[PDB]
Design an enzyme around this catalytic site. Structure first.
Site, PDB file in Angstrom:
ATOM      1  N   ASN A  39      -8.839   5.585   3.264  1.00 61.29           N
ATOM      2  CA  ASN A  39      -9.509   6.533   2.380  1.00 61.29           C
ATOM      3  C   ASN A  39     -10.374   7.521   3.158  1.00 61.29           C
ATOM      4  O   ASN A  39     -11.036   7.164   4.138  1.00 61.29           O
ATOM      5  CB  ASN A  39     -10.366   5.784   1.358  1.00 61.29           C
ATOM      6  CG  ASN A  39     -11.010   6.715   0.338  1.00 61.29           C
ATOM      7  OD1 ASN A  39     -12.175   7.083   0.466  1.00 61.29           O
ATOM      8  ND2 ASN A  39     -10.247   7.103  -0.673  1.00 61.29           N
ATOM      9  N   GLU A  52       0.825  -1.204   0.000  1.00 59.37           N
ATOM     10  CA  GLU A  52       0.000   0.000   0.000  1.00 59.37           C
ATOM     11  C   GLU A  52       0.862   1.258   0.000  1.00 59.37           C
ATOM     12  O   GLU A  52       0.619   2.187  -0.778  1.00 59.37           O
ATOM     13  CB  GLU A  52      -0.940   0.005   1.210  1.00 59.37           C
ATOM     14  CG  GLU A  52      -2.129  -0.942   1.103  1.00 59.37           C
ATOM     15  CD  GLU A  52      -3.131  -0.529   0.042  1.00 59.37           C
ATOM     16  OE1 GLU A  52      -3.044   0.611  -0.465  1.00 59.37           O
ATOM     17  OE2 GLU A  52      -4.010  -1.350  -0.287  1.00 59.37           O
ATOM     18  N   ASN A  69      -6.959  11.053  -5.112  1.00 58.27           N
ATOM     19  CA  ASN A  69      -7.725  10.463  -6.199  1.00 58.27           C
ATOM     20  C   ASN A  69      -8.556  11.512  -6.933  1.00 58.27           C
ATOM     21  O   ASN A  69      -8.757  12.634  -6.460  1.00 58.27           O
ATOM     22  CB  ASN A  69      -8.636   9.359  -5.663  1.00 58.27           C
ATOM     23  CG  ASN A  69      -7.876   8.306  -4.887  1.00 58.27           C
ATOM     24  OD1 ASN A  69      -7.091   7.549  -5.455  1.00 58.27           O
ATOM     25  ND2 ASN A  69      -8.114   8.246  -3.582  1.00 58.27           N
ATOM     26  N   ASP A  78      -6.114   8.908  -0.041  1.00 59.14           N
ATOM     27  CA  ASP A  78      -5.669   7.794   0.786  1.00 59.14           C
ATOM     28  C   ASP A  78      -4.480   8.250   1.620  1.00 59.14           C
ATOM     29  O   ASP A  78      -3.535   8.839   1.086  1.00 59.14           O
ATOM     30  CB  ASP A  78      -5.286   6.591  -0.075  1.00 59.14           C
ATOM     31  CG  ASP A  78      -6.400   6.163  -1.008  1.00 59.14           C
ATOM     32  OD1 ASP A  78      -7.565   6.126  -0.563  1.00 59.14           O
ATOM     33  OD2 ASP A  78      -6.113   5.866  -2.188  1.00 59.14           O
ATOM     34  N   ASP A 102     -11.730  11.329  -7.521  1.00 59.80           N
ATOM     35  CA  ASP A 102     -13.087  11.414  -6.997  1.00 59.80           C
ATOM     36  C   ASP A 102     -13.194  12.345  -5.794  1.00 59.80           C
ATOM     37  O   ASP A 102     -14.233  12.358  -5.125  1.00 59.80           O
ATOM     38  CB  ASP A 102     -13.597  10.019  -6.623  1.00 59.80           C
ATOM     39  CG  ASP A 102     -12.940   9.467  -5.370  1.00 59.80           C
ATOM     40  OD1 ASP A 102     -11.871   9.978  -4.971  1.00 59.80           O
ATOM     41  OD2 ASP A 102     -13.498   8.516  -4.783  1.00 59.80           O
ATOM     42  N   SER A 108     -11.486  12.151  -2.993  1.00 56.53           N
ATOM     43  CA  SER A 108     -10.962  11.523  -1.792  1.00 56.53           C
ATOM     44  C   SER A 108      -9.442  11.401  -1.870  1.00 56.53           C
ATOM     45  O   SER A 108      -8.825  11.589  -2.921  1.00 56.53           O
ATOM     46  CB  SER A 108     -11.592  10.145  -1.587  1.00 56.53           C
ATOM     47  OG  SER A 108     -11.062   9.200  -2.496  1.00 56.53           O
TER      48      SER A 108
END
Length: 129
Positions: free
Chosen positions: A59, A35, A46, A52, A48, A50
């Protein structure tokens, strides 16, 4: 902070992740490896809205509040910046919530693709536990 393999395993063991909900320690080390490459400051932003955050790439849509993500639920009840510390406590406590709220470790795409079905014990082999 960029953890070493055995250093992270020890810290995750002190936080009680070994066999948490049936997932051996090696699973958690393996997930963090693919990860974030063990980097506590890793951030993936991201398209969208959001982001991480942290060593387990948690998220911001569901789990933490960064004040910029639509439909935020903040189910771990923390600011996302707390997941970017050199201390992994916040990320571990939120991860425990993620697995227990139905999902399991399938919640982590990197675990599903690069740890599931492999010898995850190799990730803690040789370490002082």
């Amino acid at each position: 902070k960029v953890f070493g393999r055995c250093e992270l395993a020890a810290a995750m063991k002190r936080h009680g992740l070994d066999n948490y909900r049936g997932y051996s320690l090696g699973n958690w080390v393996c997930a963090a490896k693919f990860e974030s490459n063990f980097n506590t400051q890793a951030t993936n932003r991201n398209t969208d809205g959001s982001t991480d955050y942290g060593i387990l790439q948690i998220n911001s849509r569901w789990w933490c509040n960064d004040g910029r993500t639509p439909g935020s639920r903040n189910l771990c009840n923390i600011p996302c910046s707390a997941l970017l510390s050199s201390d992994i406590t916040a990320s571990v406590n939120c991860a425990k919530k993620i697995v227990s709220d139905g999902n399991g470790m399938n919640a982590w795409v990197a675990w599903r693709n690069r740890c599931k079905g492999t010898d995850v014990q190799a990730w803690i082999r040789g370490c002082r536990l």
